[PDB]
């Protein structure tokens, strides 16, 4: 059981003036290899 690294994920973009539950762009979610 060794440590590996997944693919790069699109970052969740947010605005500081906007509510925490309403990001500008939803970020990527880790998926299977």
């Amino acid at each position: 059981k060794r440590v590996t690294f997944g693919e790069d994920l699109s970052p969740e973009v947010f605005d500081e003036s906007l509510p925490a539950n309403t990001p500008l762009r939803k970020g990527g979610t880790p998926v299977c290899k």
Partner: protein, 293 residues
């Protein structure tokens, strides 16, 4: 202790205009400290955690960014969480930050974990904001209550016997994990020793072995030190925080060490993004980044 009422009020500002405070009562916060302190002491000082899990770096009182991190990674108990310390100081809302994390710790004691950072120390948070925030919004007595709670925080964690987690880094005094387990709680952070290094030491590319740290506290360590440590304890990765990085995360010594920082636009003096390491059941580590516009 009405934990659900506390969490509810803390999460209530999720869709509100950012910046507004959540003012809990003195007794509610004191209750959070007392119960969490009990759980911290009942659980090992060296945690043995299992994947899947999400690991976060410094938060530093940036409460609304913490909500954004949960908005991205999933609010508990949807996901497991391990924080590497530094929840207070520098930010404008250290109280809201630590209260939610302590509430989640009490609410989900087996799926939510908090490590001790160097800012979870009375001598440190006295200076960099937390004391002033307590004196302003509550009282000095409550600050001492937080101190008594911080002194019982676990120091390190190991994920599936492969990922070693701490706030700072390695120590020249660390030959066996037993030395960490032998550390008695409650305790303050000393100016020197194993406990000091685990919360203060940093990796350094230009250092062969161990060197002096420019902070004036603890040490620096090179890539060879990391490699020897992993091989000796059959580990694959060191996961730490303690240092602000532009992309929110940064590898060291050929992906044998990673630094996590989860506070984007760090106290209005940086344009850095925040990041978070997601570890699945196969110990495959992904990096979820919270990036400012």
């Amino acid at each position: 202790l009405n934990l659900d009422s506390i969490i509810g009020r803390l999460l209530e500002v999720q869709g509100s205009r950012p910046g507004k405070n959540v003012q809990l009562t003195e007794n509610e916060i004191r209750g959070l400290c007392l119960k969490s302190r009990e759980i911290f002491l009942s659980q090992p000082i060296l945690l043995e955690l299992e994947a899947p899990l999400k690991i976060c770096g410094d938060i530093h009182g940036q409460y609304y960014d913490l909500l954004r991190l949960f908005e991205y990674g999933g609010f508990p108990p949807e996901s497991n969480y391990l924080f590497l310390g530094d929840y207070v100081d520098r930010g404008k809302q250290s109280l809201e930050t630590i209260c939610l994390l302590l509430a989640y710790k009490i609410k989900y004691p087996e799926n939510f974990f908090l490590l001790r950072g160097n800012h979870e120390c009375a001598s440190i948070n006295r200076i960099y904001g937390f004391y002033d925030e307590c004196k302003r919004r509550y009282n000095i007595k409550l600050w001492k209550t937080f101190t008594d709670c911080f002194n019982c925080l676990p120091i390190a964690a190991i994920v599936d016997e492969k990922i070693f987690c701490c706030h700072g880094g390695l120590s020249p005094d660390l030959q066996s994990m037993e030395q960490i387990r032998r550390i008695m709680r409650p305790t303050d952070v000393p100016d020197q020793g194993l406990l000091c290094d685990l919360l203060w030491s940093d990796p350094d590319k230009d250092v062969q072995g161990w060197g002096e740290n420019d902070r004036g506290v603890s040490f620096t360590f090179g890539a060879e030190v990391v490699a020897k440590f992993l091989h000796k304890h059959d580990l694959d990765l060191i996961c730490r925080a303690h240092q602000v990085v532009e992309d929110g995360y940064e590898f060291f010594a050929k992906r044998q060490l990673v630094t996590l920082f989860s506070a984007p636009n760090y106290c209005g003096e940086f344009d850095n993004a925040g990041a978070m390491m997601s570890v699945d059941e196969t110990l495959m580590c992904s990096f979820q980044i919270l990036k400012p516009a």
